[PDB]
Amino acid sequence: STGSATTTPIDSLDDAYITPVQIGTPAQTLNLDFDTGSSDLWVFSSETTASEVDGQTIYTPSKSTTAKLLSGATWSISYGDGSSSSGDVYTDTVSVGGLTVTGQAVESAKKVSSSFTEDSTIDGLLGLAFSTLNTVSPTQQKTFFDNAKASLDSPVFTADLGYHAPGTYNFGFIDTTAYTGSITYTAVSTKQGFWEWTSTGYAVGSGTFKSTSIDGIADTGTTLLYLPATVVSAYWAQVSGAKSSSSVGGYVFPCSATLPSFTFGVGSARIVIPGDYIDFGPISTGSSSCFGGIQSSAGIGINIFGDVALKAAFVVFNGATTPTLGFASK
């Protein structure tokens, strides 16, 4: 089997991407944030505290003939941005882009933090990291990809995120029309539950490539590119007037600037992030100070190849017995 679904930016900045997902019988379609940095599929639901729902579409398990309470199971998750959610668990039929999993754990939110409430466009998350990170207790549950894997034509999914435009998540096949040149594959460590890999270096603009190992995670659920302070300083030093602002919470730059590209290495291959991808617009409405798309990972504890980086590439998440990651230009 295979699946193919379009993923759409939630706003004009590509803060996140939503992908329609069919849950239950008859189908209830919710727009979920596919997140390769976590491993829970959770939804706003009929059980979510009413004051914490503000415009989201909810899953109502009582209206699904295939929903079954997973008795005794609870979940609770905290994300890198400080947001969180928790609740109980049902199993139900879940389909993405024509690919159907029966008996998928669907984690029903009883509580969500303010960041989720305030984002009317995201109806929940669909985790695509390794199932070892799943938070269901006392019986850990598998991700949608893990459940689908044996039935897929090939044990892979691909992320093809757009810049200010829709893109695609495919399951079970590599669309050879979706990228240019060849795909370069690189080793993955699953030791922390992430799609963790090591970039071979970077360049700023038309500058020379610096060969240096940068361990980080491929994370579709993080907006920006978070890299070591040395790398980030070298980037922003090429933008007149850019500075790190503790009050704003990262590097800012004059909105009048033209940003340089940023290149990252994948083995001997190179992925180029155009300068425009690094512009996250005015810090506040009407400001002439703009927020940068490359930020320091210092104090996160991990480097994160978030959407800013991933949307510059066609990315293969290879879930073979020894997982790997592939990157192509597009």
From Swiss-Prot:
Disulfide bonds join C255-C290. Residues 17-328 form the Peptidase A1 domain. One of its GO terms (biological process) is proteolysis. The active site is at D35, S199. Its EC number is 3.4.23.22. It catalyses: Hydrolysis of proteins with specificity similar to that of pepsin A, prefers hydrophobic residues at P1 and P1', but does not cleave 14-Ala-|-Leu-15 in the B chain of insulin or Z-Glu-Tyr. Clots milk. Belongs to the peptidase A1 family. This is Endothiapepsin. It comes from Cryphonectria parasitica (Chestnut blight fungus). The gene is EAPA.
